[PDB]
CSV table of N, CA, C and O (backbone and C1' of nucleotides) in Angstrom, one decimal:
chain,number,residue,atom,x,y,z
A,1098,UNK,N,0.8,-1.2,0.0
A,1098,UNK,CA,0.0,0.0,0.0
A,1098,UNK,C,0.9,1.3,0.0
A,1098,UNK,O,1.0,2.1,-0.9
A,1099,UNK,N,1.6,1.3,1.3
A,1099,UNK,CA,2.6,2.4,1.3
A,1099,UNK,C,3.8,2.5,0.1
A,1099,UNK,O,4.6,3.4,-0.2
A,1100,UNK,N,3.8,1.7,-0.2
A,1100,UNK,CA,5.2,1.3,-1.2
A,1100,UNK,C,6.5,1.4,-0.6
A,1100,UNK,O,7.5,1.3,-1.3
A,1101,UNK,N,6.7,1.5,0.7
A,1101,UNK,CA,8.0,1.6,1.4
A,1101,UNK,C,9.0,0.5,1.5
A,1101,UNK,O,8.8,-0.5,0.8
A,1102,UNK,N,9.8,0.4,2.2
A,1102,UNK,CA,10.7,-0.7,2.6
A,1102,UNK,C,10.4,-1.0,3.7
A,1102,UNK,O,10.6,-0.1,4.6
A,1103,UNK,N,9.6,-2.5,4.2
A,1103,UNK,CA,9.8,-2.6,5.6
A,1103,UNK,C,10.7,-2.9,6.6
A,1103,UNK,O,11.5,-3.8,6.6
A,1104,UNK,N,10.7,-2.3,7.2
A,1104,UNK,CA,12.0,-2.4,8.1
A,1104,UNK,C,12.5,-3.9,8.7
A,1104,UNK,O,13.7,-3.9,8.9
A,1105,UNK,N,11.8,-4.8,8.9
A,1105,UNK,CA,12.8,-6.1,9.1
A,1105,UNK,C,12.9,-6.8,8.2
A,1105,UNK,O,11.8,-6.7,7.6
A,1106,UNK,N,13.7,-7.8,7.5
A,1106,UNK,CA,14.0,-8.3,6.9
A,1106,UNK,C,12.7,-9.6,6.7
A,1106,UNK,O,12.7,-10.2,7.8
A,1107,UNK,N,11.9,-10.1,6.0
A,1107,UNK,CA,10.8,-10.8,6.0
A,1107,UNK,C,10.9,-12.2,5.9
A,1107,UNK,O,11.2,-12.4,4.7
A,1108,UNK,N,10.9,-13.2,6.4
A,1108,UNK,CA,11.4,-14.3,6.2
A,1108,UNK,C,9.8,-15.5,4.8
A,1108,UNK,O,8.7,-15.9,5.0
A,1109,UNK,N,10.5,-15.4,3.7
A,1109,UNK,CA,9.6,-15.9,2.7
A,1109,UNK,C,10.1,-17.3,2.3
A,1109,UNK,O,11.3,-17.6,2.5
A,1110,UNK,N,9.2,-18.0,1.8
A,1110,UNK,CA,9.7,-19.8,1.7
A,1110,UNK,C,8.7,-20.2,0.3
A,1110,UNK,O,8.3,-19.4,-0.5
A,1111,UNK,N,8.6,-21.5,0.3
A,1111,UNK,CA,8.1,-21.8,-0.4
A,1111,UNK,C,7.2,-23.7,0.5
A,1111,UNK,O,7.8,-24.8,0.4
A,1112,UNK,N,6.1,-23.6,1.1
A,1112,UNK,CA,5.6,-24.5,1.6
A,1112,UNK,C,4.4,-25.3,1.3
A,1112,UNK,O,3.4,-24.6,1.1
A,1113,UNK,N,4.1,-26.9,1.1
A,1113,UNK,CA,3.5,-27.8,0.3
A,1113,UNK,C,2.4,-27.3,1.2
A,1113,UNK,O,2.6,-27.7,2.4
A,1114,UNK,N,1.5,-26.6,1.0
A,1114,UNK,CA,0.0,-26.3,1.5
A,1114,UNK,C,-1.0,-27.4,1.2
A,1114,UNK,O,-1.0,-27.7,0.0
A,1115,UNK,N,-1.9,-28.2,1.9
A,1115,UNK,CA,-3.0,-28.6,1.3
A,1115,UNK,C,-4.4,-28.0,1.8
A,1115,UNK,O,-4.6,-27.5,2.8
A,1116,UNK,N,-5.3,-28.3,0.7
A,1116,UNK,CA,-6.4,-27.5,1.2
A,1116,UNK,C,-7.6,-28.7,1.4
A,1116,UNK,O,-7.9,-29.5,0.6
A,1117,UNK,N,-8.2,-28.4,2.9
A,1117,UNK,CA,-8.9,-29.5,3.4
A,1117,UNK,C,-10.4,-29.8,2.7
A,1117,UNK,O,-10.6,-29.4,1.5
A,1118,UNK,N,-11.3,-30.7,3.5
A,1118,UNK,CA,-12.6,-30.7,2.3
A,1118,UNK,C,-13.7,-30.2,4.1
A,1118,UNK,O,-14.7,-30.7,4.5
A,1119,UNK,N,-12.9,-29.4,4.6
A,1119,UNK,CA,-13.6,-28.6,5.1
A,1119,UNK,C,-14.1,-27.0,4.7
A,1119,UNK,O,-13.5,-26.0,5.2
A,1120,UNK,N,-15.0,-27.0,4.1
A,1120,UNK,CA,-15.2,-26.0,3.3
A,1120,UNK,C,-16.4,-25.0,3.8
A,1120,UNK,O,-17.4,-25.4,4.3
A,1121,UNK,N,-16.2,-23.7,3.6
A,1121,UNK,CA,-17.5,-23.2,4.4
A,1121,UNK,C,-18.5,-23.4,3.5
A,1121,UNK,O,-19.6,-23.4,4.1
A,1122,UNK,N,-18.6,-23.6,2.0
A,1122,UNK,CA,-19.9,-23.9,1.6
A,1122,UNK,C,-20.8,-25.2,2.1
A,1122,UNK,O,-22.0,-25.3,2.4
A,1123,UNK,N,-19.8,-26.3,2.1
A,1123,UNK,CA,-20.6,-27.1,2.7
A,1123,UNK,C,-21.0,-27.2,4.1
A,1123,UNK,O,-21.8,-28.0,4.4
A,1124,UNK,N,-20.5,-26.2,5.2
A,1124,UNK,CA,-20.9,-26.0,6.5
A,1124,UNK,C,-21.9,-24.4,7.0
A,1124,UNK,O,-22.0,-23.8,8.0
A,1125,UNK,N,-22.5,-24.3,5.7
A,1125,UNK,CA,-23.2,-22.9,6.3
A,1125,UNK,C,-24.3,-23.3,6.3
A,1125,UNK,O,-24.5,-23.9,5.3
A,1126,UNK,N,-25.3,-23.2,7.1
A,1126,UNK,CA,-26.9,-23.9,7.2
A,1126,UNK,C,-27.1,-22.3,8.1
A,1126,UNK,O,-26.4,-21.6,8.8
A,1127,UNK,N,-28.4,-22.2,7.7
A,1127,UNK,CA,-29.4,-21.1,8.2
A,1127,UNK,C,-31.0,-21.8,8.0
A,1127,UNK,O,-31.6,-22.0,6.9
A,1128,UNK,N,-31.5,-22.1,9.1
A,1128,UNK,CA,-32.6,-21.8,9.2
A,1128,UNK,C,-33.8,-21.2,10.0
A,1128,UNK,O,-34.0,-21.5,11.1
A,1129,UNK,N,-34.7,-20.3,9.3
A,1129,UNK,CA,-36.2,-20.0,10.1
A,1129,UNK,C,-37.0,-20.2,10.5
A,1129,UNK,O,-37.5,-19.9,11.6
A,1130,UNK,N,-37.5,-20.9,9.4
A,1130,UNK,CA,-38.8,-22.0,9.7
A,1130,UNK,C,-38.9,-23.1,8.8
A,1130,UNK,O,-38.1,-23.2,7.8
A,1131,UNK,N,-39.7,-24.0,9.2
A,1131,UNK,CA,-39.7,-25.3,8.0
A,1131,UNK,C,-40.2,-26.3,8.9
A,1131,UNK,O,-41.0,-26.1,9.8
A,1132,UNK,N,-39.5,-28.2,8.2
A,1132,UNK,CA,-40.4,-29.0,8.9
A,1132,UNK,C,-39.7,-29.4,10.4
A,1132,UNK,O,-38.6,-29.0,10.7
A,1133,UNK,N,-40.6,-30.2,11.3
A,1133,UNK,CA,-40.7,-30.1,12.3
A,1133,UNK,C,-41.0,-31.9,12.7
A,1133,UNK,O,-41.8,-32.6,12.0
A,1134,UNK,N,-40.4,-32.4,13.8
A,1134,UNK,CA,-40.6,-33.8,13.8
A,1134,UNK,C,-41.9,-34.0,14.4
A,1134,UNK,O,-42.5,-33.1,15.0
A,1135,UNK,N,-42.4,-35.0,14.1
A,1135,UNK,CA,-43.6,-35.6,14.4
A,1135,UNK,C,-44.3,-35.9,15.3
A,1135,UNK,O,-45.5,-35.8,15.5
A,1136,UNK,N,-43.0,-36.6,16.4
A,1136,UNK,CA,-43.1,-37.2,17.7
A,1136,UNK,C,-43.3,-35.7,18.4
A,1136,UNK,O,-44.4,-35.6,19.1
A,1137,UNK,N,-42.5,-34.5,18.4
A,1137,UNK,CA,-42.0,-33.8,19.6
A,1137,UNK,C,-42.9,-32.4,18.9
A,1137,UNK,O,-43.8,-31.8,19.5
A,1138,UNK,N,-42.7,-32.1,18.0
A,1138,UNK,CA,-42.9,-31.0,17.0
A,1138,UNK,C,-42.4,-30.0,17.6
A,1138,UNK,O,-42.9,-29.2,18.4
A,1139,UNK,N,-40.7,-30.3,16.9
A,1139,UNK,CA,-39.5,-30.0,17.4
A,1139,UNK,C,-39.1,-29.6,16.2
A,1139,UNK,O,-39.5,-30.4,15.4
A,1140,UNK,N,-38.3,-28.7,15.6
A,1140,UNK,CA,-37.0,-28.5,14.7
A,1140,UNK,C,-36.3,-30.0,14.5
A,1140,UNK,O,-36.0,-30.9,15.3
A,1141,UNK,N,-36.2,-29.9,13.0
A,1141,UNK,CA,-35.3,-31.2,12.5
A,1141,UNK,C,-33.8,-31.0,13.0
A,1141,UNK,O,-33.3,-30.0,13.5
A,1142,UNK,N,-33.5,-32.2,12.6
A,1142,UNK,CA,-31.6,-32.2,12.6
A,1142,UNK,C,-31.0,-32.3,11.3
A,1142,UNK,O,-31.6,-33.0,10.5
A,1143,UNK,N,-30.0,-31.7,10.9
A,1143,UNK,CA,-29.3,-32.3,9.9
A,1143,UNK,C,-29.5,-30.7,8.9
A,1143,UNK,O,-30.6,-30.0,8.8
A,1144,UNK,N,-28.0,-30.3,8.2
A,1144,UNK,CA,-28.7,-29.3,7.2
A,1144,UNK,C,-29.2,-30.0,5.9
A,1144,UNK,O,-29.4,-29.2,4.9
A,1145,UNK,N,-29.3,-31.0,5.8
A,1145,UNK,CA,-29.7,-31.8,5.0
A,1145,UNK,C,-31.3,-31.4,4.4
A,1145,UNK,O,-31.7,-30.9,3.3
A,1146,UNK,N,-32.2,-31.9,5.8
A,1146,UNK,CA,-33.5,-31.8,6.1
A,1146,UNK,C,-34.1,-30.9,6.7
A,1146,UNK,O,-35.3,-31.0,6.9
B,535,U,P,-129.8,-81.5,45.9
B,535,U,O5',-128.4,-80.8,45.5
B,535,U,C5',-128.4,-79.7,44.6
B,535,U,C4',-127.0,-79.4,44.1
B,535,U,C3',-127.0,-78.3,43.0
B,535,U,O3',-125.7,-77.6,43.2
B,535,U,C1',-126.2,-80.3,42.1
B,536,U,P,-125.7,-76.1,43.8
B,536,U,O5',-124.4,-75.5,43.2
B,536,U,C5',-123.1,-75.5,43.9
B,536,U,C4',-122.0,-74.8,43.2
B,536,U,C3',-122.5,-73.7,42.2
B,536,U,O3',-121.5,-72.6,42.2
B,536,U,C1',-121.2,-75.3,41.1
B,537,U,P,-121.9,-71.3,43.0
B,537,U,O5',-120.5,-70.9,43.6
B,537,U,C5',-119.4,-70.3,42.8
B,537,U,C4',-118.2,-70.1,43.6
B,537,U,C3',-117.1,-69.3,42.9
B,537,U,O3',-116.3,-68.6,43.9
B,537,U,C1',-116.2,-71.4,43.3
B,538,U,P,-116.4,-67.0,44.0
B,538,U,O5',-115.0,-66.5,43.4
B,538,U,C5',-114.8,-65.1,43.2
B,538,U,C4',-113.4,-64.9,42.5
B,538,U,C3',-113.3,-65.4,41.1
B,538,U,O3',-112.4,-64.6,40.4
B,538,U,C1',-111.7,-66.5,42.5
B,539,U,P,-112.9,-63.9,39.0
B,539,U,O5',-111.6,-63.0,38.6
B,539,U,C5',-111.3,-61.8,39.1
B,539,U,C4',-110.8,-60.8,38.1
B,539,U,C3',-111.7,-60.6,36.9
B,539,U,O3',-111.7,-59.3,36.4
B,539,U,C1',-109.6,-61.3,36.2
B,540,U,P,-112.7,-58.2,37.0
B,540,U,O5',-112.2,-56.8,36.3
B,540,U,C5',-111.0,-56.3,36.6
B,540,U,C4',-110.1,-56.2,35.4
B,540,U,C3',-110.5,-55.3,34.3
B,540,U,O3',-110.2,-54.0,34.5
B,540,U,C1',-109.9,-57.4,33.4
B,541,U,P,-111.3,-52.8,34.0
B,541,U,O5',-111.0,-52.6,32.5
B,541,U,C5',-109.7,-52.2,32.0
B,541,U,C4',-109.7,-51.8,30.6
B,541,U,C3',-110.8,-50.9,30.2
B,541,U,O3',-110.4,-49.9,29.2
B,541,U,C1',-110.9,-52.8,28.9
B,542,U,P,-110.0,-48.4,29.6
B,542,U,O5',-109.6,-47.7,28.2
B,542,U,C5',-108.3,-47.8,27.7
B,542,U,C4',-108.3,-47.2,26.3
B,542,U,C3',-108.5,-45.7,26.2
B,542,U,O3',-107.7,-45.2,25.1
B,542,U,C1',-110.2,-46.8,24.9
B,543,U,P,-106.6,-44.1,25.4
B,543,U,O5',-107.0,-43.0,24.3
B,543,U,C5',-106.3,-41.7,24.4
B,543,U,C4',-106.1,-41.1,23.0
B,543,U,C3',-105.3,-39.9,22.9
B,543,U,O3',-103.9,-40.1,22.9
B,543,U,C1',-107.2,-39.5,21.6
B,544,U,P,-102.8,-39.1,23.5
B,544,U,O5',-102.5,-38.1,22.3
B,544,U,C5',-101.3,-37.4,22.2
B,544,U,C4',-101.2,-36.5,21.0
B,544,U,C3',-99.9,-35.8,20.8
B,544,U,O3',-99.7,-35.6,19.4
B,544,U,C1',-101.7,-34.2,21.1
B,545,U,P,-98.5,-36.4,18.7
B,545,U,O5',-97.3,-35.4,18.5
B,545,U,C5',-96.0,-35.8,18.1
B,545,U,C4',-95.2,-34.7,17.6
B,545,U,C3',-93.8,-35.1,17.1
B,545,U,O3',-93.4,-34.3,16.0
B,545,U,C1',-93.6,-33.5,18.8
B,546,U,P,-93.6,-34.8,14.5
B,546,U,O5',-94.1,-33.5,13.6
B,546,U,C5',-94.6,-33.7,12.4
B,546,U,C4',-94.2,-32.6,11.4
B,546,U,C3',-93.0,-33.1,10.5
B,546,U,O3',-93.2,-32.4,9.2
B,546,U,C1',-92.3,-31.2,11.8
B,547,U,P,-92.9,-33.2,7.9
B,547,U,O5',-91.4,-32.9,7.5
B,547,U,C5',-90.8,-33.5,6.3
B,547,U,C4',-89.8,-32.5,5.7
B,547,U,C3',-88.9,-33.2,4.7
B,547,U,O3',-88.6,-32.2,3.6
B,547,U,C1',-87.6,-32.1,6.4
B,548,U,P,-88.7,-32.7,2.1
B,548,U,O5',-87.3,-33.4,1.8
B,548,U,C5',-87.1,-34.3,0.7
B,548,U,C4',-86.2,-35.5,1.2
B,548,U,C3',-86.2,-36.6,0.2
B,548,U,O3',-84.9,-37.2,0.2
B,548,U,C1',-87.0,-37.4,2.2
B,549,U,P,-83.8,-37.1,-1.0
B,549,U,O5',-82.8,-35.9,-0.4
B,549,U,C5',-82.5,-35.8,0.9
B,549,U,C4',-82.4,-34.4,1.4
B,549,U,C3',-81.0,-33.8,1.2
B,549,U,O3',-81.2,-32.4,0.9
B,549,U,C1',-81.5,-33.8,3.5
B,550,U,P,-80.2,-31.6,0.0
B,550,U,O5',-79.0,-31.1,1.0
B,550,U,C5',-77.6,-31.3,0.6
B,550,U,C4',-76.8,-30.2,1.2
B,550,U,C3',-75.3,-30.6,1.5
B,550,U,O3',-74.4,-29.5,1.3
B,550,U,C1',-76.4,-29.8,3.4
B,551,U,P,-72.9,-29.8,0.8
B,551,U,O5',-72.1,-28.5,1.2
B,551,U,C5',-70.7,-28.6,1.6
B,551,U,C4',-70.0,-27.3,1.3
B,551,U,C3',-68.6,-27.2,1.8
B,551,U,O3',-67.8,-26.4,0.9
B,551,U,C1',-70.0,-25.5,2.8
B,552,U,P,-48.6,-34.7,7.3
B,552,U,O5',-47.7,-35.2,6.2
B,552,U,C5',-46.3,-35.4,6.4
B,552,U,C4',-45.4,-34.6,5.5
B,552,U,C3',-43.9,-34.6,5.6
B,552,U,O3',-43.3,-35.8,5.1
B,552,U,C1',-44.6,-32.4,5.4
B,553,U,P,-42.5,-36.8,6.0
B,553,U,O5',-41.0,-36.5,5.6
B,553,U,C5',-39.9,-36.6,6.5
B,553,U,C4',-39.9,-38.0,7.1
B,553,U,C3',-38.9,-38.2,8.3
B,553,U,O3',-39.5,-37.7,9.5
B,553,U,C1',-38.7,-40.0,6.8
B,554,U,P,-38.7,-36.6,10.4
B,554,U,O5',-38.6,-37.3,11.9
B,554,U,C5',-37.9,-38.4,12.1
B,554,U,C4',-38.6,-39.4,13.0
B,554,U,C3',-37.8,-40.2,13.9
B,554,U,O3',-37.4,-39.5,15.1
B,554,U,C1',-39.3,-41.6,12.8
B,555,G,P,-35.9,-39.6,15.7
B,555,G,O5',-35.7,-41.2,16.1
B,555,G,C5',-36.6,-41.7,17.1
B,555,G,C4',-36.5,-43.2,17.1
B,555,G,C3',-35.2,-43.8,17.3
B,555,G,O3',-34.7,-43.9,18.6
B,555,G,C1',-36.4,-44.9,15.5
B,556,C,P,-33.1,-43.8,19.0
B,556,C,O5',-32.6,-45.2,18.5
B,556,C,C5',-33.1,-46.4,19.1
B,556,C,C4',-32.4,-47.6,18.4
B,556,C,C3',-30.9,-47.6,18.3
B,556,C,O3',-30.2,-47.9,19.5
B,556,C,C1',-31.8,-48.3,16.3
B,557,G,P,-29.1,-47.0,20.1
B,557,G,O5',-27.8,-47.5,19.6
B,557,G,C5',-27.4,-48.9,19.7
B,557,G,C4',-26.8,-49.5,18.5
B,557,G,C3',-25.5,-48.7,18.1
B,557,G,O3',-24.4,-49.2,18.8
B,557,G,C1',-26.8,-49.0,16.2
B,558,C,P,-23.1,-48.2,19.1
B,558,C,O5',-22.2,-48.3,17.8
B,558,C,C5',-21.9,-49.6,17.3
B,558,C,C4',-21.4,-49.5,15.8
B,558,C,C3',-20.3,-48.5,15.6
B,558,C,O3',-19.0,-49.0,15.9
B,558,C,C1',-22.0,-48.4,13.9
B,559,C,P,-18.0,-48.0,16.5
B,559,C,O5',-17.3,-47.3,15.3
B,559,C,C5',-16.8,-48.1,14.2
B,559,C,C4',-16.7,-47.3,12.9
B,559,C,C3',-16.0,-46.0,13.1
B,559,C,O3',-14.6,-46.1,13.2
B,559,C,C1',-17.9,-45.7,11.8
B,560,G,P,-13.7,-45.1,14.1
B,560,G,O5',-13.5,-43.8,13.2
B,560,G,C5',-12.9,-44.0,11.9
B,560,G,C4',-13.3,-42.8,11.0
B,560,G,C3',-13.0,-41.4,11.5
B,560,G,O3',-11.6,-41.1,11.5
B,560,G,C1',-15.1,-41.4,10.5
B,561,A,P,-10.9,-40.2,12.6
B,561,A,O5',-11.4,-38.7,12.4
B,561,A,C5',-11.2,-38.1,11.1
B,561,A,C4',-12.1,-36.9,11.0
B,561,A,C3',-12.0,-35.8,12.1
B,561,A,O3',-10.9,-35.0,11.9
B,561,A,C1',-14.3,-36.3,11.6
B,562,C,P,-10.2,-34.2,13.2
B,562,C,O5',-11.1,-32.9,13.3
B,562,C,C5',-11.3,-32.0,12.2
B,562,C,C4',-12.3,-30.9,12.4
B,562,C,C3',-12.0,-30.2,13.8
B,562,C,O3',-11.1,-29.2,13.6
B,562,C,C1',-14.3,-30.7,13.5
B,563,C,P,-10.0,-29.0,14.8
B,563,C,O5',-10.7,-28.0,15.9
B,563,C,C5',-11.2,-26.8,15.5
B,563,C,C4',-12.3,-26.3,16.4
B,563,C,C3',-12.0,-26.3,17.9
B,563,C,O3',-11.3,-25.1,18.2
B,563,C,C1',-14.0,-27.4,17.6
RNA sequence: UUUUUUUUUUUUUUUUUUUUGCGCCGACC
């Protein structure tokens, strides 16, 4: 941003990264309203359902 | 030549508007 020289010396590499199959697409669930179990008529489980 | 039964009136149409449970395994914080 500044275009300066930083003042310490930055220690840079090159490291085998892997990227997990934990993903936030597959872990964002939101819900309001919807279905409801039978027995309790309770909120489901699962973001599936 | 012979006894021991009783008797009367007041309630209406062809018909109508969303898979629970059981157990197992792996994994995240």
């Amino acid at each position: 941003i500044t275009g300066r020289r930083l003042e310490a010396d930055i220690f840079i590499g090159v490291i085998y990264y892997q990227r997990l199959h934990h993903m936030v697409a597959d872990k964002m669930h939101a819900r309001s309203r919807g279905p409801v179990q039978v027995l309790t008529k309770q909120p489901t489980e699962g973001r599936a359902r």
